[PDB]
């Protein structure tokens, strides 16, 4: 389909966690989602929340719909479980690597299914809990997923980072490596 821009509401439900997710993307970038626990709309940038708003009921309702047809399809398919498509992982920095200038390390988990996943930021073998954030389970047009993981860090020639990923389609945890210089 020819289009100058694509505006896609996208949502999913499943047996394990995350049990549900509802969001709207503009040209494949997530604009806002609906926190299903806090029953709220969360805008990705202040540019967005300063302008328009969204009925958080419109997401919670579509999730209950998605859940109703989750079953009636579990039964209709004779309980069909899908194949575990394994993830591809890339680790790259947000800005050019200047030793000293704080940076953000991006871990991109791509082309995986189902949307169940563990991710751990390892610095020198040890995991990092402070100064980390992550995107949502972002749907693709081929109905798999991709996720973004972020860690703020100060480039050191004495430091070494890994993004450890767990998925049911992998035999072992996948370690993706990044190093300064």
């Amino acid at each position: 389909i020819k289009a100058d821009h694509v505006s896609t509401y996208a949502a999913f439900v499943q047996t394990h966690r995350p049990t549900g997710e509802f969001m709207f993307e503009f040209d494949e970038d997530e604009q806002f989602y609906v926190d299903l626990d806090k029953k709220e709309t969360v805008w990705h940038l202040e540019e967005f929340g300063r302008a328009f708003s969204f009925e958080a009921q419109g997401g919670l309702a579509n999730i209950a719909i998605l859940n109703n047809n989750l079953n009636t399809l579990i039964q209709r398919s004779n309980h069909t479980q899908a194949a575990n498509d394994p993830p591809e992982v890339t680790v790259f920095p947000k800005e050019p690597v200047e030793l000293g200038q704080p940076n953000t390390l991006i871990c991109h988990i791509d082309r995986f299914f189902p949307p169940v996943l563990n991710v751990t930021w390892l610095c020198n073998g040890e995991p990092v809990t402070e100064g980390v954030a992550e995107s949502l389970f972002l749907p693709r047009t081929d109905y798999s997923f991709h996720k973004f993981h972020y860690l703020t860090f100060v480039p050191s020639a004495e430091d070494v980072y890994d993004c450890r990923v767990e998925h049911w389609g992998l035999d072992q945890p996948l370690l993706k490596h990044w190093e300064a210089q």
């Binding site: 389909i1 020819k2 289009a3 100058d4 821009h5 694509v6 505006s7 896609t8 509401y9 996208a10 949502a11 999913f12 439900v13 499943q14 047996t15 394990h16 503009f26 040209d27 494949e28 970038d29 997530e30 604009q31 990705h44 940038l45 540019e47 967005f48 302008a51 328009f52 579509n62 998605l66 859940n67 047809n69 989750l70 399809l73 579990i74 209709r76 398919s77 309980h79 069909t80 479980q81 899908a82 575990n84 498509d85 790259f92 947000k94 800005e95 050019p96 991006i106 991109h108 189902p114 949307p115 169940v116 995107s135 972002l138 749907p139 081929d142 109905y143 798999s144 973004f148 049911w168």
Partner: protein, 188 residues
């Protein structure tokens, strides 16, 4: 031995081209889309056998079908106008750094990397120049890297063999820029 898991997905897609709005709607069990509304079709159509109980029942119910036909001008065109006021007008300027991949000798072959970061939208043009002439060969581009935070990133490398006094220039053409932006690097 994977735990038990069944996944149901939904996609409501608006395609904006020219002045039009084509509403796509997709019903998806696991990774298989079975039922779909296409605005160019006017009714639900099962993509697989899984969606025959829905497509026929959802069709022939006028209250649902009429609501779905008006979607292109009720939320698609409506949201698109709201996006043109804010989302389309977002212009973040590309920051450009230039450096060799590795440091060492002069007459040895090396790669000059033009690292363009934190721009939006993603349509960007990067060009390489050696002593005023466009290098049209030996250019290795890691095409557009989406960062997941409404900013793009791209690395464009030039296959070089630097001589003393050679001047390399990276040019960047982006919609957020009034004129081309240049960053320089001399071999020394």
């Amino acid at each position: 031995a994977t735990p038990e898991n069944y996944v149901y997905q939904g996609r409501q897609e608006c395609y904006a081209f020219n002045g039009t709005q084509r509403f796509l709607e997709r019903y998806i069990y696991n990774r298989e889309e079975y039922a779909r509304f296409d605005s160019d079709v006017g009714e639900f159509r099962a993509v697989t056998e899984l969606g025959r109980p829905a497509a026929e029942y959802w069709n022939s119910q006028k209250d649902i079908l009429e609501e779905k036909r008006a979607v292109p001008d009720r939320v698609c065109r409506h949201n698109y106008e709201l996006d043109e006021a804010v989302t389309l007008q977002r212009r973040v300027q590309p920051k450009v750094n230039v450096s060799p991949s590795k440091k060492g000798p002069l007459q040895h072959h090396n790669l000059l990397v033009c690292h363009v970061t934190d721009f939006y939208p993603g349509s960007i043009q990067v060009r390489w120049f050696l002593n005023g002439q466009e290098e049209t060969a030996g250019v290795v581009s890691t095409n557009l890297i989406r960062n997941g935070d409404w900013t793009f990133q791209i690395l464009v490398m030039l296959e070089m063999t630097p001589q003393q006094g050679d001047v390399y220039i990276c040019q960047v053409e982006h919609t957020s820029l009034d004129s081309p932006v240049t960053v320089e690097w001399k071999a020394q």
